[PDB]
């Protein structure tokens, strides 16, 4: 939808897991939705969350996952 | 598999600690 676009994580969520755990990452960096950095992300086992790209373990997780 | 860049050092290792996840809270649309 491109009519009315928020945020991709209108909020993040505080779960800290590894990259085998993670099996999906996608980084939002402020859009003309939404003027924030926002990490959107799947976990196999795990969901698929909204999360904190300022949080350590996101930092490793993320990085060990790209 | 990336590429691209320039400069670096140190870095790598998986996980982190302290919390964990699953469980709930998160959303968007």
């Given at each position: ?14 779960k ?9 990452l ?17 976990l ?9 790209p300022k ?12 | ?29």
């Open positions: 939808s491109a009519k009315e676009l928020r945020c991709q994580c209108i909020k993040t969520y505080s800290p897991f590894h990259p085998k755990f993670i099996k999906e996608r980084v939002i960096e402020s859009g003309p939705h939404c003027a924030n950095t926002e990490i959107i992300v799947k196999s086992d795990g969901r698929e969350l909204c999360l904190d949080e350590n373990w996101v930092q490793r997780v993320v990085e060990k996952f790209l | 598999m990336s590429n691209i860049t320039d400069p670096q050092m140190w870095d790598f290792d998986d996980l982190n600690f302290t919390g964990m996840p699953p469980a709930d809270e998160d959303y968007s649309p």
